[PDB]
Design an enzyme around this catalytic site. Structure first.
Site, PDB file in Angstrom:
ATOM      1  N   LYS A 282     -13.028  -0.695   3.525  1.00  0.00           N
ATOM      2  CA  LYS A 282     -13.174  -2.150   3.446  1.00  0.00           C
ATOM      3  C   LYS A 282     -11.814  -2.784   3.730  1.00  0.00           C
ATOM      4  O   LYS A 282     -10.791  -2.115   3.584  1.00  0.00           O
ATOM      5  CB  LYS A 282     -13.706  -2.581   2.066  1.00  0.00           C
ATOM      6  CG  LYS A 282     -12.940  -2.009   0.894  1.00  0.00           C
ATOM      7  CD  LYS A 282     -13.465  -2.516  -0.420  1.00  0.00           C
ATOM      8  CE  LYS A 282     -12.523  -2.131  -1.541  1.00  0.00           C
ATOM      9  NZ  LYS A 282     -13.033  -2.555  -2.864  1.00  0.00           N
TER      10      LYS A 282
ATOM     11  N   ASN B   4      -8.745  -2.267   1.530  1.00  0.00           N
ATOM     12  CA  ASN B   4      -8.134  -0.940   1.612  1.00  0.00           C
ATOM     13  C   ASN B   4      -7.461  -0.644   2.952  1.00  0.00           C
ATOM     14  O   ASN B   4      -6.883   0.431   3.155  1.00  0.00           O
ATOM     15  CB  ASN B   4      -9.180   0.131   1.288  1.00  0.00           C
ATOM     16  CG  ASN B   4      -9.627   0.077  -0.156  1.00  0.00           C
ATOM     17  OD1 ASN B   4      -9.054  -0.656  -0.967  1.00  0.00           O
ATOM     18  ND2 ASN B   4     -10.646   0.861  -0.495  1.00  0.00           N
TER      19      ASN B   4
ATOM     20  N   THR C   6     -17.862   0.245  -2.840  1.00  0.00           N
ATOM     21  CA  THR C   6     -17.975  -1.198  -3.103  1.00  0.00           C
ATOM     22  C   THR C   6     -19.318  -1.718  -2.586  1.00  0.00           C
ATOM     23  O   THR C   6     -19.723  -1.398  -1.463  1.00  0.00           O
ATOM     24  CB  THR C   6     -16.795  -1.995  -2.479  1.00  0.00           C
ATOM     25  OG1 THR C   6     -15.554  -1.420  -2.899  1.00  0.00           O
ATOM     26  CG2 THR C   6     -16.822  -3.457  -2.910  1.00  0.00           C
TER      27      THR C   6
HETATM   28  C1  LIG Z   1       2.617  -6.519   0.493  1.00  0.00           C
HETATM   29  O1  LIG Z   1       1.325  -6.236  -0.048  1.00  0.00           O
HETATM   30  C2  LIG Z   1       0.914  -4.934  -0.236  1.00  0.00           C
HETATM   31  C3  LIG Z   1       1.554  -3.799   0.283  1.00  0.00           C
HETATM   32  C4  LIG Z   1       1.079  -2.503   0.057  1.00  0.00           C
HETATM   33  N1  LIG Z   1       1.766  -1.493   0.598  1.00  0.00           N
HETATM   34  C5  LIG Z   1       1.337  -0.233   0.402  1.00  0.00           C
HETATM   35  C6  LIG Z   1       0.211   0.124  -0.344  1.00  0.00           C
HETATM   36  C7  LIG Z   1      -0.220   1.459  -0.531  1.00  0.00           C
HETATM   37  N2  LIG Z   1       0.469   2.537   0.024  1.00  0.00           N
HETATM   38  N3  LIG Z   1      -1.327   1.747  -1.256  1.00  0.00           N
HETATM   39  C8  LIG Z   1      -2.052   0.749  -1.827  1.00  0.00           C
HETATM   40  C9  LIG Z   1      -3.231   1.187  -2.607  1.00  0.00           C
HETATM   41  C10 LIG Z   1      -3.268   2.436  -3.249  1.00  0.00           C
HETATM   42  N4  LIG Z   1      -4.300   2.924  -3.982  1.00  0.00           N
HETATM   43  C11 LIG Z   1      -5.376   2.120  -4.113  1.00  0.00           C
HETATM   44  C12 LIG Z   1      -5.473   0.865  -3.538  1.00  0.00           C
HETATM   45  O2  LIG Z   1      -6.563   0.051  -3.648  1.00  0.00           O
HETATM   46  C13 LIG Z   1      -6.515  -1.327  -3.271  1.00  0.00           C
HETATM   47  C14 LIG Z   1      -7.668  -2.039  -4.005  1.00  0.00           C
HETATM   48  N5  LIG Z   1      -8.911  -1.235  -3.782  1.00  0.00           N
HETATM   49  C15 LIG Z   1      -7.497  -2.261  -5.530  1.00  0.00           C
HETATM   50  C16 LIG Z   1      -6.581  -1.306  -6.266  1.00  0.00           C
HETATM   51  C17 LIG Z   1      -5.199  -1.568  -6.361  1.00  0.00           C
HETATM   52  C18 LIG Z   1      -4.357  -0.677  -7.035  1.00  0.00           C
HETATM   53  C19 LIG Z   1      -4.888   0.476  -7.622  1.00  0.00           C
HETATM   54  C20 LIG Z   1      -6.258   0.752  -7.532  1.00  0.00           C
HETATM   55  C21 LIG Z   1      -7.103  -0.138  -6.856  1.00  0.00           C
HETATM   56  C22 LIG Z   1      -4.383   0.405  -2.782  1.00  0.00           C
HETATM   57  C23 LIG Z   1      -1.675  -0.590  -1.671  1.00  0.00           C
HETATM   58  C24 LIG Z   1      -0.529  -0.941  -0.918  1.00  0.00           C
HETATM   59  C25 LIG Z   1      -0.085  -2.302  -0.716  1.00  0.00           C
HETATM   60  C26 LIG Z   1      -0.730  -3.462  -1.243  1.00  0.00           C
HETATM   61  C27 LIG Z   1      -0.248  -4.763  -1.010  1.00  0.00           C
HETATM   62  O3  LIG Z   1      -0.827  -5.918  -1.479  1.00  0.00           O
HETATM   63  C28 LIG Z   1      -2.122  -5.882  -2.085  1.00  0.00           C
END
Ligand SMILES: COc1cc2ncc3c(N)nc(-c4cncc(OC[C@@H](N)Cc5ccccc5)c4)cc3c2cc1OC
Length: 274
Positions: A133, A136, A160
């Site tokens: 999605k 992600n 989702t």
């Molecule tokens: C400037 O903005 C951003 C820069 C970023 N850069 C690198 C990232 C990375 N390597 N992994 C994740 C990531 C890793 N596990 C799970 C994830 O689930 C996203 C969503 N389902 C909700 C969520 C968030 C966190 C944990 C679990 C679920 C995302 C996010 C980011 C990231 C996010 C940013 O803004 C949101």
């Protein structure tokens, strides 16, 4: 060589989930920015998520592709697990979708193509995402995609609500065609501005999915529409990209991808999102 929390200057929280927090961190010795996923061991053990987090790390270790997140390091203290990941300066794709409303044909094609190549790589390793999605799918400083969130990923021998495939609501069975379904939802969402199946609650969304209850807006790009109709197929055996349909060749040969050069996508300069 094992890094420590002391080796970093931790900064803002980038994202939050039930089992993890992602935080921006500057490595002090190198000045390098990483997105560190922090996971509390106690909460993982209590909710029986050990097989999930183990699998997530193992899947991410195997990823060696420009359209995916990279795992640079892991460490732990007494309380927490730390996964050091690629930092994607421009954030989620969903943010850009909402900002400019919907993509034009050039941007839709380019970004759809990057997701297709990423999935081609992923599925060729026998790995399935299961939660694909726009949230992600990140964008780096160059505005190329970086797919993240491998917490519910599967390696072969519900994600989702809006991106859930029909077969997942029937046999409780997940494979490569679930990802390809989600792809079709994402393409629709890029062109229309919103995902195809929308309702008041989760039950009503699931109803629409299994009935294939969605409509194309009149202005929808005809070749993009034709592609979406071939991915949003109820029978998971009949979707473009899947093994029964002879894989990624026919998918990439779709008329919507006519002008795409598939072989070097990540070195092409991305179109401006206007
Ligand atoms: C400037 O903005 C951003 C820069 C970023 N850069 C690198 C990232 C990375 N390597 N992994 C994740 C990531 C890793 N596990 C799970 C994830 O689930 C996203 C969503 N389902 C909700 C969520 C968030 C966190 C944990 C679990 C679920 C995302 C996010 C980011 C990231 C996010 C940013 O803004 C949101």
């Amino acid at each position: 060589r094992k890094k420590r929390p002391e080796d970093f200057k931790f900064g803002k929280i980038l994202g939050e989930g039930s089992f993890s927090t992602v935080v921006l961190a500057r490595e002090l010795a190198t000045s390098r920015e990483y997105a560190i996923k922090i996971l509390e061991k106690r909460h993982i053990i209590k909710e029986n998520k050990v097989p999930y987090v183990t699998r997530e790390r193992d899947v991410m270790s195997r990823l060696d592709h420009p359209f995916f997140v990279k795992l640079y390091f892991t460490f732990q203290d007494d309380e927490k697990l730390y996964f050091g990941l690629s930092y994607a300066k421009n954030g989620e794709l969903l943010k850009y979708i909402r900002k400019i409303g919907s993509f034009d044909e050039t941007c839709t094609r380019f970004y759809t193509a990057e997701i297709v190549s990423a999935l081609e790589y992923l599925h060729g390793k026998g790995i399935i995402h299961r939660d694909l999605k726009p949230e992600n799918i990140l964008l780096n400083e160059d505005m190329h995609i970086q797919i993240t969130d491998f917490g519910t990923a599967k390696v072969l021998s519900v994600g989702t609500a809006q991106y859930v495939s029909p077969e997942l609501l029937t046999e409780k069975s997940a494979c490569k065609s679930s990802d390809l379904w989600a792809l079709g939802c994402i393409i629709y969402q890029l062109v229309a501005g919103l995902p195809p199946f929308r309702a008041g609650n989760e039950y009503l969304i699931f109803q629409k999915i299994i009935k294939l209850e969605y409509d194309f807006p009149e202005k929808f790009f005809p070749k993009a529409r034709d592609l979406v109709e071939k991915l949003l197929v109820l029978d998971a055996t009949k979707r473009l990209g899947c093994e029964e349909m002879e894989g990624y060749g026919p998918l990439k040969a779709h008329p919507f991808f006519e002008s795409v050069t598939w072989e070097n996508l990540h070195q092409q300069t991305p179109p401006k999102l206007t």
